[PDB]
């Protein structure tokens, strides 16, 4: 939506004198804009900006403030945006003007965001993002609060509105590029706005942009620690199934690496990795590893994620973890349960403490109200016999034999199925 109106505005020039003659602007302002329009070559533009720099931003502000018809205001805004594209350093003239006026840069521009035209307001937003991201003067306090509040309100609209939310997210990203704005945005409820707009089925480009933002947050250790209060990963894992596009797949992989890299604690890494594995990210990483892509980042990140997810799977497969989940009632398909190598290595560990692990399992076989826990108990009891031959008589002693051969008639088909698997384990041979 931005591009066509920008192109039209580049051409929709009109006489700036129309407003000087109406006494809405000053003669020097009109003269500056006319001279700058005539002075088109790069050297001439620099000469104007360096000879009349104090008048430059003042002319822009005066015309934007006092002009009724949009075309001229949009012309100024598009000119500033294109001048920043030509040379990003052009943010410096506004700061020079503000300092000469003994003022900060923000009160001049922030009110523009409340104007009527979506094009003009969002172009002002792009200009503000460029200015306050490149310049020494960051946005702070009530000013940044209102600016990100405006970002939030534009997001709240959630299509031309979505295509403008493209610019909203672009400004947000160009700001988060610098650390301070990241903490400001996390302090605000803006991350909740990202969650809301993502869940509200926003468009593909917007998905890439918000995953860009969460990837920026994950880059920082403390912001990565902060964002768990939302837990994007359950959304992102399944949305990756549809977003096969290289853009989105790459950025989500990068955000995943950032989570598992910049997680501050071993427990933080375990939380993120557990979300991943219980939402089945590991098989997807194996599939993507079989797949091959254009650039380094996608495949290097898939390889790193395979490394770290494998390490997390081994950790969860730790014998101490198995005992601790048995103690904590978390018989809910942690990777230890299906990691066959763990079972081969540690099936004897179920004899430890005089078969306390099997005792927990066989007490849960008549104490577990949760069908998941009951089924996992029966299945683990069967796996014990599968992996440790002498366990046949131990299970007969503890009643796991009878308990599973009965619970294959349990009221929940999942429990019935797992109990049938366990009884098959017992009957693997004599």
Partner 1 sequence: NFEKIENELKEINTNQEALKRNFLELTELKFILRKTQQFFDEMADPDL
CB of 429 to partner 1, least distance (A): 6
Instruction: Report the nearest approach of partner 1 to the CB of residue 424 (Å).
Output: 5
For residue 162, state whether it binds partner 1 (rule: CB under 8 A): no
Question: With binding defined as CB under 8 A, does residue 340 bind partner 1?
Answer: no
Closest to partner 1 by CB, 124 or 385: 385
Q: What's the CA gap between 62 and 108, in Å, rounded?
A: 10
Q: Of the two residues 102 and 283, which places its CB atom closer to partner 1 in the complex? A: 283
Residue 7 touching partner 1 (CB under 8 A): no
Task: Give the per-residue contact string, 198-227, with partner 1 (x = CB under 8 A; - = no).
Answer: ------------------------------
**Cβ closest to partner 1, residue 262 vs residue 379:** 379
Measured from the CB of residue 358, what is the shortest distance to partner 1 in angstroms?
Answer: 23
Give me the least distance between CB of 427 and partner 1, in Å please.
Answer: 6
Cα 263 to chain centroid distance, Å, stands at 14
**Among 76, 66, 57, residue whose Cα is nearest residue 25:** 66
Tell me the closest approach of the beta carbon of residue 414 to partner 1, in angstroms: 14
Between residues 201 and 338, which has the closer beta carbon with respect to partner 1? 338
Interface with partner 1, residue 241, by CB under 8 A = no
Closest CB to partner 1 among residues 292, 429: 429
Site stretch for partner 1 (CB under 8 A), options 37-45, 222-230, 255-263, 420-428: 420-428
Distance of closest approach, residue 278 Cβ to partner 1, in angstroms: 18
How far apart are CB 196 and partner 1 at their closest, in Å?
A: 33
How far apart, in whole angstroms, are the C-alpha atoms of residue 343 and residue 332?
16
Residue 338 CB, shortest distance to partner 1, in Å, is 11
Three-state SS letters, the chain: CHHHHHHHHHHCCCCCHHHHCCCCCCHHHHHHHHHHHHCCCHHHHHHHHHHCHHHHHHHHHHHHHHCCCHHHHHHHHHHHHHHHHHCHHHHHHHHHHHHHCCCCCHHHHHHHHHCCCHHHHHHHHHHHHHHHHHCCCCCCHHHHHHHHHHHHHHHHCCCHHHHHHHHHHHHHHHHHCCHHHHHHHHHCCHHHHHHHHHHCCCCHHHHHHHHHHHHHHHHCHHHHHHHCCCCCHHHHHHHHHHCCCHHHHHHHHHHHHHHHHHCCCHHHHHHHHHHHHHCCHHHHHHHHHHCCCCCHHHHHHHHHHHHHHHHHHHHHCCHHHHHHHHHHCCCCCCHHHHCHHHHHHHHHHHHHHHHHHHHHHHHHHHHCCCHHHHHHHHHHHHHHHHHCCCHHHHHHHHCHHHHHHHHCCCCCHHHHHHHHHHHHHHCCCC
If one asks whether residue 428 binds partner 1 (CB under 8 A), the answer comes out as yes
26, 278, 406, 424: residue in contact with partner 1 (rule CB under 8 A):
424
Segment near partner 1 (CB under 8 A); pick from 162-170, 242-250, 380-388, 421-429: 421-429
Size of the site for partner 1 (CB under 8 A): 5
Told to check if 430 binds partner 1 by CB under 8 A, we report yes
**By CB under 8 A, is residue 351 in contact with partner 1?**
no
Closer residue to partner 1, CB minimum distance, 13 or 338: 338
The dihedrals phi and psi of 132, each to the nearest 5 degrees, come to: -85, -5
As measured in angstroms, the least distance from the Cβ of 339 to partner 1 is 16
Q: Does 427 bind partner 1 (CB under 8 A)?
A: yes
Choice between 40 and 429, CB closer to partner 1: 429
Q: Does 287 bind partner 1 (CB under 8 A)?
A: no
Q: Applying CB under 8 A, which residues contact partner 1?
A: 424, 427-430
């Amino acid at each position: 939506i931005i591009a066509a109106k920008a192109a039209e505005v580049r051409a929709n020039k009109v006489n700036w004198q129309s407003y000087l003659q109406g006494q809405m602007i000053s003669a020097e302002d009109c003269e500056f804009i006319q001279r700058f329009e005539m002075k088109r070559c790069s050297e001439e533009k620099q000469e104007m900006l360096q000879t009349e720099g104090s008048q430059c931003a003042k002319t822009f502000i005066n015309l934007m403030t006092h002009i009724s018809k949009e075309q001229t205001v949009q012309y100024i805004l598009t000119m500033v945006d294109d001048m920043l594209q030509e040379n990003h350093q052009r943010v410096s003239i506004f700061f020079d003007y503000a300092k000469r006026s003994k003022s900060t840069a923000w009160p001049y521009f922030l009110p523009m965001l409340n104007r009527q035209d979506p094009f003009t307001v969002h172009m002002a937003a792009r200009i503000i993002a460029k200015l306050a991201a490149w310049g020494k003067e960051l946005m702070e306090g009530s000013d940044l609060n209102y600016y990100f509040n405006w970002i939030k309100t534009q997001l709240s609209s959630q299509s031309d509105s979505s295509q403008y939310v493209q610019c909203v997210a672009g400004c947000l990203q160009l700001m988060l590029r610098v650390n301070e704005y990241r903490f400001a945005w996390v302090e605000a409820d803006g991350v909740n706005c990202i969650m809301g707009v993502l869940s509200n089925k926003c468009g593909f480009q917007l998905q890439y942009q918000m995953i860009f933002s969460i990837w920026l947050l994950a880059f920082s250790p403390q912001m990565c620690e902060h964002l768990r209060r939302y837990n994007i990963i359950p959304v992102l894992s399944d949305i990756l199934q549809e977003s096969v596009k290289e853009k989105v797949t790459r950025i989500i992989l990068a955000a995943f690496r950032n989570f598992l890299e910049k997680s501050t604690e071993r427990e933080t890494r375990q939380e993120y990795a557990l979300a991943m594995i219980q939402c089945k990210v590991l098989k997807q990483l194996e599939n993507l590893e079989q797949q091959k892509y254009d650039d380094e980042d996608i495949s290097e990140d898939i390889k790193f994620l395979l490394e770290k997810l494998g390490e997390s799977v081994q950790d969860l497969s730790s014998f101490d973890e198995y005992s601790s989940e048995l103690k904590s009632g978390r018989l809910e398909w942690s990777p230890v349960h299906k990691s066959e190598k763990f079972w081969r290595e540690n099936a004897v560990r179920l004899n430890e403490k005089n078969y306390e692990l099997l005792k927990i399992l066989t007490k849960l076989l008549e104490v577990s109200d949760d069908p998941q826990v009951l089924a996992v108990a029966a299945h683990d009891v069967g796996e014990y016999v599968r992996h440790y031959p002498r366990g046949k008589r131990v299970i007969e002693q503890l009643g796991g034999k009878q308990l599973v051969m009965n619970h294959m008639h349990h009221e929940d088909q999942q429990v019935r199925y797992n109990a049938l698997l366990a009884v098959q384990k017992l009957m693997v041979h004599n």
